[PDB]
Amino acid sequence: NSLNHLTSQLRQNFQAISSSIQAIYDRLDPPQADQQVDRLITGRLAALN
Amino acid sequence: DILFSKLVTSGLGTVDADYKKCTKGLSIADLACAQYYNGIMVLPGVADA
Amino acid sequence: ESADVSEMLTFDKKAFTLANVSSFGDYNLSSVIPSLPRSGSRVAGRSAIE
Amino acid sequence: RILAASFNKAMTNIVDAFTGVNDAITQTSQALQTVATALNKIQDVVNQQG
Amino acid sequence: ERMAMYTGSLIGGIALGGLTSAASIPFSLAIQSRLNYVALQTDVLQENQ
Amino acid sequence: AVLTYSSFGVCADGSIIAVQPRNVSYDSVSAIVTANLSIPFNWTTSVQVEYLQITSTPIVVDCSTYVCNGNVRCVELLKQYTSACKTIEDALRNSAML
Amino acid sequence: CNPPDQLVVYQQAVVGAMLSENFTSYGFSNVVEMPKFFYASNGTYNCTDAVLTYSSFGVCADGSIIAVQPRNVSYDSVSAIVTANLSIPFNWTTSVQV
Amino acid sequence: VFVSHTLTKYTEVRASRQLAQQKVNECVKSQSKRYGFCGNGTHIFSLVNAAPEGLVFLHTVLLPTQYKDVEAWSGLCVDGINGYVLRQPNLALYKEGNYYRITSRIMFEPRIPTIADFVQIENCNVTFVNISRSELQTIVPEYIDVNK
Amino acid sequence: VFVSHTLTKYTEVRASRQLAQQKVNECVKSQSKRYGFCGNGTHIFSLVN
Amino acid sequence: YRITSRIMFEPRIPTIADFVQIENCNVTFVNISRSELQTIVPEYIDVNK
């Protein structure tokens, strides 16, 4: 169950613009996309914790 | 019985609620019933007296 | 966590005074016996392994 | 006879130490110290589980 | 401080032999007593020490 | 001392003090030697108390009521958290039964 | 409007339902009172076996809720030194435990 | 976070419950000789009562009050060629005035020396008791040399 | 998160202390005949530091 | 003949107290008569015959 809980956390938006890191940079400019990617970084580090 | 009354009578913490009392609600819900309305269910202890 | 350790650490003078290299003869237990206090003000220090 | 009398002696002090009415003397011996230690865990399991 | 007094007491207890006034036996007899607890010794000239 | 931590204790009136280890008498294996030996002769009885916890009052929660408070349409957002509720609710159920 | 019930499942079938209410919910035709909850099932109460257990309660194969009695053993004894009729084991059997 | 609290507590209670089962089997039903498991001291019997979410044990143990000093001897040597030691390592042979007795080392329980209390070995140690076959009647009362 | 690490660490330490107290009483203050508890072989004596 | 511990080789001269009398003989016991039993137990003198 633990692995399935961990792999399911990768579809979380964490209220970023999108769940795909590449899709954020396809949609936004670098100075704005960093503030969006940071949500995915913090949220997924919480998933690993 | 001394080791069951000499200690604090913590009736406001863990207590297996009377679920049949809660839903009829002839009086305003108790603390044990309010937890039951939030999905928290305290089961009767296995150490039967 | 402190109470568990404090109950475990018991002491006995009658046996501590025999923690010496002379008490064991041909069995060289010098590397484990407590070190003599270099400057007093404590009962003992670490051994040669501690 | 001494074994029976001493057991009755200790078995009464255990009850007094559980109630705690002998509070000023509960620390008088190791036998009553185990009662205090027991009361310290029974205190915790009652005050923490909620 | 307390650890050196704890391990020190435990180390020196092996030299005790239950003698009057707690005078320590030669350590060969502390070993010999502990060998008897395994099997009843019959080598009385004590070559194996 | 009434309260203790590490080597520091405090007695009833509030004075701080260092703590001494409890003095006991270690036993000794009686040796096989022609010499004077001491043997216990006069016995007394004592009772020593020990407490061990053997159970903890188990608690089970419903992952739906706690989160959505029974709201109908909130349920159809929580169901997309496919592995969330099962992990929380099986971890509590299996522990209680074992 | 809808507080949580608990269903009972055994061998992939549903056999009972712990309820807070005097109804024959979920199609079960027999309702019984317990100290802190109603219980509904198709149990016949012609039963004394326990396939599932919690605390001091349990259920039969048909879903009848029953109290689990403590299991029976015969404690050994320290054979005393006395002039009397003693009993001593005489016949032996082999048991395997997992 | 709540589940993390519960699983951690179940780890402790599970470990403490195993120890309680061991102490019921080895201190309450049985009598133990493991040191310190059923209490500091010599174990006799134990009692158990219910407690909040657990059990309480009352270990009844013996603690010595007085000791006796005895002139113990390592063994026996007869005619200087035959050596005897005690059959149990936990026994001790000691002199009491003008006669010999045998006692246990854990508790003082005096015993009249029987010939079966000894085990014959093939050498002597000099520090043994030094007697002849005509004099073994002063150490072992039942002994009477029939070949002589 | 920090409290979770500390509580999980004290669980392992408590179990390891309980075993240590057993081995102090049975391997150091006494001579053990329980196989494999104080070495793989015939235990004689133990030392602690 | 000699007697030794199975745990450790400690030779022993057989005293009559080392034995326990039982009701029947196995087909593998040492085949001996009371007169010549002194070859197994040196100190045994037949005080009947």
Ligand SMILES: *[C@@H]1O[C@H](CO)[C@@H](O[C@@H]2O[C@H](CO)[C@@H](O[C@@H]3O[C@H](CO)[C@@H](O)[C@H](O)[C@@H]3O)[C@H](O)[C@H]2NC(C)=O)[C@H](O)[C@H]1NC(C)=O
């Ligand atoms: C018991 O064991 C201890 C070690 O724990 C032995 O002490 C060590 O002995 C060696 C040999 O003497 C020492 O090394 C040499 O010492 C001489 C004299 O100082 C020096 O000229 C050499 O250059 C070299 O250092 C070693 O330092 C010493 N260690 C300690 C910590 O004392 C001891 O000799 C053993 N005793 C017995 C009776 O088995």
Ligand SMILES: *[C@@H]1O[C@H](CO)[C@@H](O[C@@H]2O[C@H](CO)[C@@H](O[C@@H]3O[C@H](CO)[C@@H](O)[C@H](O)[C@@H]3O)[C@H](O)[C@H]2NC(C)=O)[C@H](O)[C@H]1NC(C)=O
């Ligand atoms: C060890 O565990 C076994 C369980 O397999 C226990 O043996 C069983 O114990 C019960 C209760 O004493 C026995 O039941 C008795 O049967 C007789 C004959 O029917 C009846 O007259 C008694 O009133 C009672 O019902 C059961 O026969 C017995 N046998 C077997 C083969 O398991 C055992 O008691 C346990 N022992 C200890 C020391 O814990």
Ligand SMILES: *[C@@H]1O[C@H](CO)[C@@H](O[C@@H]2O[C@H](CO)[C@@H](O)[C@H](O)[C@H]2NC(C)=O)[C@H](O)[C@H]1NC(C)=O
């Ligand atoms: C077991 O516990 C007893 C305490 O009940 C310890 O005995 C005490 O030992 C100290 C040693 O300095 C003496 O001052 C006390 O007078 C003793 N008191 C009592 C009441 O016994 C004992 O040392 C412990 N250990 C053993 C092996 O008996």
Ligand SMILES: *[C@@H]1O[C@H](CO)[C@@H](O[C@@H]2O[C@H](CO)[C@@H](O)[C@H](O)[C@H]2NC(C)=O)[C@H](O)[C@H]1NC(C)=O
């Ligand atoms: C006979 O047994 C005793 C012990 O019960 C021995 O006594 C000491 O043993 C050591 C050797 O282990 C000797 O170095 C000591 O000299 C003996 N003690 C005294 C006070 O002299 C005794 O030596 C044993 N016999 C032999 C030959 O070793």
Ligand SMILES: *[C@@H]1O[C@H](CO)[C@@H](O[C@@H]2O[C@H](CO)[C@@H](O)[C@H](O)[C@H]2NC(C)=O)[C@H](O)[C@H]1NC(C)=O
């Ligand atoms: C028992 O008798 C023997 C034999 O006489 C004694 O052994 C001799 O002891 C003296 C000193 O007392 C030594 O000089 C001899 O060398 C010993 N003999 C041998 C063969 O070594 C022994 O001491 C006597 N023991 C007692 C307790 O009386």
Ligand SMILES: *[C@@H]1O[C@H](CO)[C@@H](O[C@@H]2O[C@H](CO)[C@@H](O)[C@H](O)[C@H]2NC(C)=O)[C@H](O)[C@H]1NC(C)=O
């Ligand atoms: C007692 O006698 C039985 C036979 O009644 C012994 O068993 C025999 O052991 C030998 C060993 O070489 C085998 O060759 C035989 O075939 C065995 N026979 C049977 C029927 O098992 C047994 O070993 C003897 N027991 C003791 C304790 O000495």
Ligand SMILES: *[C@@H]1O[C@H](CO)[C@@H](O[C@@H]2O[C@H](CO)[C@@H](O)[C@H](O)[C@H]2NC(C)=O)[C@H](O)[C@H]1NC(C)=O
């Ligand atoms: C001890 O004597 C018995 C009896 O004389 C021997 O047992 C006999 O062995 C022969 C072997 O050919 C058998 O034919 C007999 O049937 C046995 N007798 C009985 C009564 O069973 C035994 O072999 C001898 N054992 C030793 C070790 O000498």
Ligand SMILES: *[C@@H]1O[C@H](CO)[C@@H](O)[C@H](O)[C@H]1NC(C)=O
């Ligand atoms: C050992 O004993 C001698 C004599 O008492 C003393 O000089 C030495 O300092 C002692 N050492 C220890 C470690 O106890």
Ligand SMILES: *[C@@H]1O[C@H](CO)[C@@H](O)[C@H](O)[C@H]1NC(C)=O
């Ligand atoms: C233990 O005994 C020592 C003996 O030197 C003494 O100084 C110390 O105060 C005693 N402590 C306790 C707690 O009994």
Ligand SMILES: *[C@@H]1O[C@H](CO)[C@@H](O)[C@H](O)[C@H]1NC(C)=O
């Ligand atoms: C043993 O005690 C006796 C008195 O009972 C005494 O003469 C002797 O010196 C003591 N010690 C030894 C080592 O023999």
Ligand SMILES: *[C@@H]1O[C@H](CO)[C@@H](O)[C@H](O)[C@H]1NC(C)=O
């Ligand atoms: C044994 O201990 C008790 C302790 O009260 C004492 O009264 C008695 O006199 C002691 N001695 C004997 C020989 O019983």
Ligand SMILES: *[C@@H]1O[C@H](CO)[C@@H](O)[C@H](O)[C@H]1NC(C)=O
């Ligand atoms: C539950 O309802 C039944 C009828 O459906 C009735 O006979 C019974 O008395 C009721 N019990 C309680 C405890 O209210």
Ligand SMILES: *[C@@H]1O[C@H](CO)[C@@H](O)[C@H](O)[C@H]1NC(C)=O
């Ligand atoms: C329970 O018994 C009733 C009796 O009328 C029956 O209708 C129903 O099918 C049974 N099974 C279930 C699962 O309710």
Ligand SMILES: *[C@@H]1O[C@H](CO)[C@@H](O)[C@H](O)[C@H]1NC(C)=O
């Ligand atoms: C219950 O079951 C037993 C065993 O099958 C049977 O003898 C009995 O008649 C049944 N009915 C009742 C009412 O006990």
Ligand SMILES: *[C@@H]1O[C@H](CO)[C@@H](O)[C@H](O)[C@H]1NC(C)=O
């Ligand atoms: C154990 O024995 C009692 C009577 O001594 C009996 O009532 C009970 O049914 C038995 N236990 C079980 C589990 O059946």
Ligand SMILES: *[C@@H]1O[C@H](CO)[C@@H](O)[C@H](O)[C@H]1NC(C)=O
């Ligand atoms: C033992 O029991 C039998 C039968 O109950 C009786 O005849 C005999 O006298 C008893 N003996 C003793 C010593 O109790």
